[PDB]
Amino acid sequence: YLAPLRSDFTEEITAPKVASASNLVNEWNN
Amino acid sequence: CTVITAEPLDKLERVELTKKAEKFVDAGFKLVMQEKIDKKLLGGFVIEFSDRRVDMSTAKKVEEFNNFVNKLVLSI
Amino acid sequence: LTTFTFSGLQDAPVAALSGSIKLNVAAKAGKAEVTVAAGAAKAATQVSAAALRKLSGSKISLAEVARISVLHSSIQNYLLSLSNERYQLLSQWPDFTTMYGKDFYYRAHPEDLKKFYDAADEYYKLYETVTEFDSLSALASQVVPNYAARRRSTVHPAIGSTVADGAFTNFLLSKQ
Amino acid sequence: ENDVPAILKEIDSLVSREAVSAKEVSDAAVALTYLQVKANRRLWGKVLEKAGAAQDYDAASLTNLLWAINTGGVEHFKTVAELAGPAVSLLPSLSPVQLSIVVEALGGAGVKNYELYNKASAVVVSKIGEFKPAEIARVLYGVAFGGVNDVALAKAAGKVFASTEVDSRTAAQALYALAKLGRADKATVDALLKSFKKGTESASDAAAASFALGSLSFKAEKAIVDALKASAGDLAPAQAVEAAYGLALSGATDAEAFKALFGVVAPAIEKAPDALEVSSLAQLHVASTISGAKLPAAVGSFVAKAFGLAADAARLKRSSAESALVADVAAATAVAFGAQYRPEVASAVASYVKTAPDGSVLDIAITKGDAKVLVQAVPSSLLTSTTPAKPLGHVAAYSKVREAQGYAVAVVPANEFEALPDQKAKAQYVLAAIKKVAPSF
Amino acid sequence: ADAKALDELRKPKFSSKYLIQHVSQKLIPAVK
Amino acid sequence: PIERQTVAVYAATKGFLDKVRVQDIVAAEEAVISQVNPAVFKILKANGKITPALDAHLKAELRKVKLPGA
Amino acid sequence: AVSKKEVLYFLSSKDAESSTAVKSYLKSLYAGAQVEATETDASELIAQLEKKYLSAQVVEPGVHNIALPLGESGSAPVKRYAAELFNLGAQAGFECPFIEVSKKFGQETATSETVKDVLNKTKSYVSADYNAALNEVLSSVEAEINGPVLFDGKTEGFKKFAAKAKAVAVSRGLPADTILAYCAGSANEDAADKVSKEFFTWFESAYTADAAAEVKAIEAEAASILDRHLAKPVAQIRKEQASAYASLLKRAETAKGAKWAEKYLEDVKAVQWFDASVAEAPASGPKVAA
Amino acid sequence: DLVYRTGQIVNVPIGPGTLGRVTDGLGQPIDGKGPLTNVRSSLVEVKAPGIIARQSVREPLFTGVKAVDALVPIGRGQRELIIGDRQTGKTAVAIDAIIHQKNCNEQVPKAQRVYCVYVAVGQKRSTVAQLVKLFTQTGA
Ligand SMILES: Nc1ncnc2c1ncn2[C@@H]1O[C@H](COP(=O)(O)OP(=O)(O)OP(=O)(O)O)[C@@H](O)[C@H]1O
Ligand SMILES: [Mg+2]
């Protein structure tokens, strides 16, 4: 449940990188 | 010599600077000077001696500060 | 909340809106006869107009007791909410155990029966992992540290592209 | 048969079931304020847990809930700020008497919702006669404390407070809203100030008009001051501080009004010194100085450090257009005291940064033997929001505390200082302002 | 052991805050 | 690994892989590494020597092996 | 203990462990301890650096206290989430994000007098979708006079570039006249009131769309992480996670005496209290001191 | 043109952060995985360790090639030439020494594990990308 601790900053101001729709509702419907 | 600064000097900015710059000539030498301006420098100066330069400008003191703390947070 | 609050016994709720709890206030000019009735119990006191004003003097200031954090619990509640959408489509799986009898075993092609017994072993693989809800709390910790580093921005925690583009229009379309 | 703790368990089992609606969670909250249930925090937590879960919300149950959150003094920012979703969808559906309770409760909690207060002020100026004077003050308290500097409403409220005279509690909400907006309109403050010798019934609205006058620096009222001296037991220790701070800033010196107020806050700090904010411990030290009424020996020495703490904390978190102004004023203070070249002004303003006696750091602190002056830059956040633009009462707060430390505070405000064209004009503006305060320089 | 507090139970647990404090206690004394 | 090199070099230098066609010595030792005991490699790796308690015990375990042709 | 520049930064902070360090400091100052004189030292580059590492100790526990509005419908959970990050900015010493990123522009481009260099070292802070739509207009106006467009403002060679970049700013949706007429201002307080009410109508529709784009990326990451995990057998999952849990404990156990490692293993002990306190009464929850 | 001196003899980053990375001839990484973290710059021209800093080469380096480990065996600390004509298998002897160390490093204690460095001088870049593909697939 525990995470790696990170101490670093974000210097850019970017878009947050929306990941793609994983095919699992369409694989479990198959 | 050639001294490049950010904006043109005072008469006291001239006198405090030779006290910096005759410690860059290693004998009983006299510096003449040549005064140029560059606001790419953020204050301080660049002394150019045609065989060496010394950059006590704060525009490079920023970059020499940033790369010191961009190296040290990666060492911790 | 602020330091001074200016509500209480003026423009107040006079009556309840439900039936689960029965509220009756009786406002005079100075005090009020409230009568509350919830379940079998009843209570009726006298609230002064300057007794409700002292209520907002020391604030409650509720705060959430989380297992790890409020951020993590909101990601884990979303993964629990997403596991429910996948469990709902394992709810609509045909009962393959109605075809386990030997009158389906021996009428069927030997390769279409091995596919049927593999498709039944597959449902138990899918169903035993979608109900592994003790694994959602460690999947939420794979979302937290990359999110938390985007919030450690050197500009602002709440900065984004639409604001920082709108403030480039002010910076560029003014003089130098 | 009169069962108050046995009806708390019957309310607890109403909100601990699975599908509590809006009306059942409104009336559970309304019943917890009329019963005055500050001691049970978990029962207030179960109500606001179901108040976020409740999805349908008609006009009456939203305002009964938001009334109960505001009146009960319960704050949870996540729950209340998501109740602004029902509100902006029920906003044409709201009564004018109901819209005042929504915007007062959502504004008083600090909900940053610009779509709410824009539509809720455009309603209250489209139908300005439809709102009674208590409702135009509740909206004005909400839009002010929700971070909107809507002066279109503050004018339309000012025309109402001039046409009809209002209740004491109605005026003191309107004074508190104009104090945060920093308006100090003489035309409308004095129209609300006549409501305070008909007799006020709360001490919370005598203390809030006290705070709102001193923050705009008008002066004391002599019946607000004399309502506060009788009923300073009704006030919480964080509320009696803001009464005494607001009386000190307005120039009251009724020391028996200050013995009543400091009789609340002194045994509270003695019982738990961390009970108050360090912003409120500093507002005590301003009040324990300008009026001069002293405190216990363990308290007044303790709030003297917490003026030093709360002054560096606002200097560390300086607005960076205030950091531009201080380094501009300090450079003009170098040129005024004689420095025509840049190595002189660079090494003079590094000598102006002496430490205060309480542990703090002053930015432009000149010392000539015994006489010390202090130059104070007052940017724009400490100015009023109106066109004369005198500084707020908090700058006279900071001045009189430093003046009682061996300084002579010269105020340099940026509405006057930055209308000046060059550094020589700004040097004699500072030099006139220093010699107007201590002419030994 | 039971019934800790409220103000001790309000802490977010696996935040950094102490890597941030650690790399601030070995950078500011090193760059001064 | 070094223990399967020396076992295969043992099978050729102790005369266990004549009577075998010279074309399929490549396939003969693929049996020999796989058909002898997977526990006899662990002893040779841990000792580093083929001990007297093992050089007979492996050469008698290099007889219970099936080689191609034979 | 705290180094007295931390405790000045935790006064307006409102998380738990920063306020209990403040409250035990204010309890020491009630028992007559002297408030240490804060430093009028640490010149401008060091003051900017330790402010950056003191704001990030107010931001970092504060981000973990803000519930993401994942899978919610409406604008008010996203406006709550944005407003909690605004107040976290103000508690940590930041100004408004408009005032914070504009300071980042004018600091990064204090040396530049040409627009092609302004559009090049403000690259990290504007969209590449917007940095390109200004570089198309710039390299057409520099293909019109065949000289670099200057960052001067009074140059007419900039004036018809800024009139075309204003046409780009509407082509994104940004009200370029409204944003300019706010950060400039007006004389009367009534005509500047109507332009603040339509800047803040843009601004609230701006920062909601950055928060909602942040939520839609956490929603898409978590739905991608789950569907990769729902395709595993359960025996793989329990040992992938026990391997990752145990490797992360020994990274905190081999760390000798570091403050983060003691606080790490103190929070593992506090999670195990939470699981044990719930097991004692599950319809009640965890036991708080009341 | 102006050429400035850097004051430093030629150096490269050494340390454990170079493991797994493909660097160029001066240590700058060319695999496109960011900067070399956890690394330290040391000189490339060092005086070799002298007589009093050595000891006898006694422990074996197992190549995994049984023509080598039987006939021409290699100790740890020994330079061994692989000489031959073109396309005679000189890299294959060298690659199999690297791949075998991965198989041996999973079985030995932490003290005696062999960390390989492969310097590819003057080769194709395609030949090098085929080797880091093999070394990633094998786990080496
Ligand atoms: N032990 C082996 N068994 C079978 N085939 C091999 C063996 N060693 C090498 N080969 C094959 O022979 C070819 C030549 O091998 P390799 O590339 O190792 O030679 P090289 O000495 O590196 O030549 P060069 O560097 O001159 O190209 C390779 O294609 C490889 O597939
Ligand atoms: Mg080769």
Breaks (C-N over 2.5 A) in chain E follow: none
Rounded to the nearest angstrom, the distance between the alpha carbon of G145 and the centre of ligand 1 is 62
Query: What does each C-alpha distance from C7 to C2, C61, D240, D277 come to in angstroms?
Result: 12, 18, 19, 24
Question: Residues near D119 by Cβ (< 8 Å), separated by ≥ 6?
Answer: D88, D91
Q: What is the DSSP letter of H52?
A: G
Rounded to the nearest angstrom, the distance between the alpha carbon of H113 and the centre of ligand 1 is 27
HSE, CB side, 13 Å, CA atoms: give it for residue G93. 26
- Are B76 and E31 inside 8 Å of each other by CB? no
Where does a domain end: D146, D170, D200?
D200
Radius of gyration in angstroms for the set of CA atoms belonging to chain H, rounded to a whole number: 18
Which residue has 């006020």 as its token pair?
D200
- Are E15 and C63 inside 8 Å of each other by CB? no
Count CB-CB contacts under 10 A for residue H127. Answer: 10
Query: What does each C-alpha distance from B25 to B53, E22, G92 come to in angstroms?
Result: 12, 44, 49
Burial D92-103 (b: 16+ CB within 10 A, else e): eebeeebbbbbb
Question: Residues near C55 by Cβ (< 8 Å), separated by ≥ 6?
Answer: C8, D33, D36, D38, D71, D72, D73
The reply to whether D150 and D229 lie within a common domain is: no
* Long-range contacts, D394-397 (Cβ 8 Å, 24+): D394/D215, D394/D249, D396/D217, D396/D249, D397/D245, D397/D248, D397/D249, D397/D283, D397/D286, D397/D290
Whether H contacts D, i.e. 3 or more CB pairs less than 8 A apart, is no
Q: Resolution of the experimental model in angstroms, please?
A: 2.9
Residue type, C82: L
Helix, strand and coil in chain E, % to nearest 5 = 25, 0, 75
How far is G138 from G144, CA to CA, in rounded Å? 10
Q: Which residue of G has its CA nearest to B69?
A: G49
**CB < 8 Å from E in window 1-30 of A:** 2-3, 5-7
The reply to whether D329 and D430 lie within a common domain is: yes
The reply to whether D92 and D195 lie within a common domain is: yes
Minimal CA–CA distance to G245: which of F63, D180, C137? C137
D238 touches chain G (CB under 8 A): no
HSE, CB side, 13 Å, CA atoms: give it for residue D1. 1
How far is G118 from D85, CA to CA, in rounded Å? 41
Which residue has 């939420």 as its token pair?
C140
The set of protein residues with a Cβ atom below 6 angstroms from ligand 1 is H 84, 86-92
Q: Give G108→chain D minimum CA distance, Å.
A: 16
Report whether C23 contacts C8 (CB < 8 A): no
How far is G58 from G15, CA to CA, in rounded Å? 8
Query: What does each C-alpha distance from F29 to F58, F61, G131, H97 come to in angstroms?
Result: 15, 14, 67, 22
Count CB-CB contacts under 10 A for residue G266. Answer: 11
β-strand partners of D413:
D378
Rounded to the nearest angstrom, the distance between the alpha carbon of H93 and the centre of ligand 1 is 9
Minimal CA–CA distance to G271: which of C20, D379, C76? C76
Which residue has 């109740």 as its token pair?
D83
Centroid of chain to Cα D229: 21
Q: Give C61→chain G minimum CA distance, Å.
A: 11
The reply to whether D67 and D96 lie within a common domain is: no
Report whether B1 contacts B21 (CB < 8 A): yes
β-strand partners of H14:
H40
Minimal CA–CA distance to H11: which of H36, H38, H39, H41? H41
Question: And the tokens for F58?
Answer: 């492996």
Write the DSSP string, G142-190: TTTSSSPPBTTSSSHHHHHHHHHHHHHHHHHT--HHHHHHHHS--SSTT
Where does a domain end: D183, D200, D217?
D200
The reply to whether D191 and D212 lie within a common domain is: no
How many helices (DSSP H) and strands (DSSP E) are in chain E?
Answer: 2, 0
Report whether G124 contacts G132 (CB < 8 A): no
How far is A1 from H62, CA to CA, in rounded Å? 42
Q: Give G65→chain E minimum CA distance, Å.
A: 6
- Are G221 and A22 inside 8 Å of each other by CB? no
- Are C148 and E16 inside 8 Å of each other by CB? yes
Sign, Cα dihedral of G123, G124, G126, G129: positive
Centroid of chain to Cα C28: 42
C59 touches chain G (CB under 8 A): no
Q: Give G172→chain A minimum CA distance, Å.
A: 15
| Chains in contact with chain G (at least 3 beta-carbon pairs closer than 8 A) | A, B, C, D, E
Number of domains in chain D: 4
How far is F10 from F15, CA to CA, in rounded Å? 8
Minimal CA–CA distance to G245: which of E15, C144, A1? A1
HEC string for G5-27: CHHHHCCCCCCHHHHHHHHHHHH
How far is A25 from G231, CA to CA, in rounded Å? 11
H33 marked among binding-site residues: no
Sign, Cα dihedral of D230, D233, D236, D237: positive
Burial class (CB in 10 A: 0-12, 13-18, 19+), G283: exposed
The structure's method of determination equals cryo-EM
Q: At what angle do helices D96-108 and D59-72 cross, to 10 degrees?
A: 40
Q: What is the DSSP letter of D374?
A: E
Rounded to the nearest angstrom, the distance between the alpha carbon of H128 and the centre of ligand 2 is 10
Count CB-CB contacts under 10 A for residue C34. Answer: 23
- Are C164 and A25 inside 8 Å of each other by CB? no
Three-class SS state of D207: helix
- Are E14 and C68 inside 8 Å of each other by CB? yes
Burial G122-149 (b: 16+ CB within 10 A, else e): bebbbbeebbebbbebbeebbeeeeeeb
Minimal CA–CA distance to C20: which of F19, D17, H65? D17
Residue G114 sits at φ, ψ, to 5 deg, of -115, 150
Ligand 1 atom 23, closest CA: H87
Rounded to the nearest angstrom, the distance between the alpha carbon of H87 and the centre of ligand 2 is 7
Burial class (CB in 10 A: 0-12, 13-18, 19+), D153: buried
The reply to whether D87 and D194 lie within a common domain is: yes
Cβ-Cβ contacts under 8 Å, D135 against chain C: 11
Ion ligand 2 nearby residues (CB, 5 A): H 91
Question: And the tokens for B61?
Answer: 């003191």
Report whether G121 contacts G112 (CB < 8 A): yes
Write the DSSP string, chain B: --EEESS---HHHHHHHHHHHTTSS-SS------EEE-TTS-SS-EEE-SS-EEE--HHHHHHHHHHHHHHHTTT-
Q: Judging by DSSP bridges, how do beta strands B46-48 and B53-55 pair with one another?
A: antiparallel
Sign, Cα dihedral of D123, D127, D132, D137: positive
Report whether D280 contacts G15 (CB < 8 A): no
How far is G101 from C165, CA to CA, in rounded Å? 9
β-strand partners of B4:
B36, B46
Helix, strand and coil in chain G, % to nearest 5 = 65, 0, 35
Write the DSSP string, H6-45: -S---EEEESGGGTT--B-TTS-B-SSS-S--S-EEEESS
Where does a domain end: D56, D82, D108?
D82
Question: And the tokens for D247?
Answer: 């009386």
Minimal CA–CA distance to E17: which of A3, D222, H139? A3
Breaks (C-N over 2.5 A) in chain D follow: none
Question: And the tokens for G199?
Answer: 């800047």
Whether H contacts F, i.e. 3 or more CB pairs less than 8 A apart, is yes
Three-class SS state of D228: helix
How far is D37 from C167, CA to CA, in rounded Å? 47
How far is C62 from D80, CA to CA, in rounded Å? 11
Q: What is the DSSP letter of G35?
A: P
Domain that holds residue D32: 4-82
How far is D387 from D299, CA to CA, in rounded Å? 40
Residue E8 sits at φ, ψ, to 5 deg, of -90, -25
How far is B38 from B35, CA to CA, in rounded Å? 10
How far is H105 from H114, CA to CA, in rounded Å? 7
Minimal CA–CA distance to H4: which of B51, D95, D23? B51
Choose the closest CB to G245 out of A2, A13, A16: A2
H90 marked among binding-site residues: yes
Ligand 1 atom 5, closest CA: H89
Query: What does each C-alpha distance from C106 to C98, C101, C121, D11, D42 come to in angstroms?
Result: 15, 9, 20, 63, 64
* Helix (H) / strand (E) containing D257: helix D255-271
Minimal CA–CA distance to D66: which of G237, F2, C11? C11
**CB < 8 Å from D in window 88-147 of G:** 93, 95, 99, 103
Sign, Cα dihedral of D67, D70, D74, D79: positive
Question: Residues near H115 by Cβ (< 8 Å), separated by ≥ 6?
Answer: H19, H101
Report whether D62 contacts D86 (CB < 8 A): yes
How far is B46 from G126, CA to CA, in rounded Å? 33
Q: What is the DSSP letter of D340?
A: -
Which residue has 């001696």 as its token pair?
B49
Three-class SS state of G218: helix
Report whether D281 contacts D305 (CB < 8 A): no
How far is D114 from H14, CA to CA, in rounded Å? 56
Question: And the tokens for D297?
Answer: 């020996």
How far is G72 from G82, CA to CA, in rounded Å? 14
Choose the closest CB to A9 out of C126, C140, C152: C152
| Chains in contact with chain C (at least 3 beta-carbon pairs closer than 8 A) | A, D, E, G
Question: And the tokens for E11?
Answer: 């802490």
Ligand 1 atom 10, closest CA: H89
Which residue has 């993401």 as its token pair?
G68
Angle CA(D13)–CA(D18)–CA(D23) in degrees, nearest 5?
Answer: 75
β-strand partners of H61:
H74
Q: Judging by DSSP bridges, how do beta strands D409-413 and D371-378 pair with one another?
A: parallel
Minimal CA–CA distance to D305: which of G26, G95, G208, H133? G26
Report whether B60 contacts G45 (CB < 8 A): no
Report whether C59 contacts D74 (CB < 8 A): yes
How far is D299 from D237, CA to CA, in rounded Å? 13
Minimal CA–CA distance to D29: which of D2, D53, D55, D63? D63
Three-class SS state of C147: helix
Q: Which residue of G has its CA nearest to A4?
A: G248
H136 marked among binding-site residues: no
Write the DSSP string, C37-71: EETTEEE--EEETTTSTTTTSS--------SS-HH
The number of the ligand nearest the C-alpha atom of H63 reads 1
Report whether G38 contacts D361 (CB < 8 A): yes
Whether E contacts G, i.e. 3 or more CB pairs less than 8 A apart, is yes
Q: Give B22→chain E minimum CA distance, Å.
A: 28
Question: And the tokens for H103?
Answer: 């198989």
* Helix (H) / strand (E) containing C164: helix C161-172
Helix, strand and coil in chain F, % to nearest 5 = 60, 0, 40
How far is D93 from D205, CA to CA, in rounded Å? 31
How far is G36 from D355, CA to CA, in rounded Å? 11
How far is C19 from D308, CA to CA, in rounded Å? 56
Question: Residues near G268 by Cβ (< 8 Å), separated by ≥ 6?
Answer: A2, G249, G252
How far is C58 from D73, CA to CA, in rounded Å? 7
Write the DSSP string, C86-112: HHHHHTT---GGGG-SHHHHTTS-HHH
Q: Judging by DSSP bridges, how do beta strands H40-43 and D371-378 pair with one another?
A: unpaired
How far is G130 from C162, CA to CA, in rounded Å? 10
Q: At what angle do helices D59-72 and D22-34 cross, to 10 degrees?
A: 30
Note the maximum CA span of chain E. Answer: 46
H92 marked among binding-site residues: yes
- H helices present in chain H, as ranges: 66-71, 90-105, 125-138
The reply to whether D431 and D362 lie within a common domain is: yes
Report whether G30 contacts D309 (CB < 8 A): no
How far is D311 from D348, CA to CA, in rounded Å? 23
How far is F22 from F28, CA to CA, in rounded Å? 9
Centroid of chain to Cα G44: 23
Report whether G89 contacts C151 (CB < 8 A): no
The reply to whether D324 and D312 lie within a common domain is: no
Write the DSSP string, C122-146: HHHHHHHHHT-GGGHHHHGGGTHHH
Cβ-Cβ contacts under 8 Å, G110 against chain B: 42
Q: What is the DSSP letter of E6?
A: S
HSE, CB side, 13 Å, CA atoms: give it for residue D306. 32
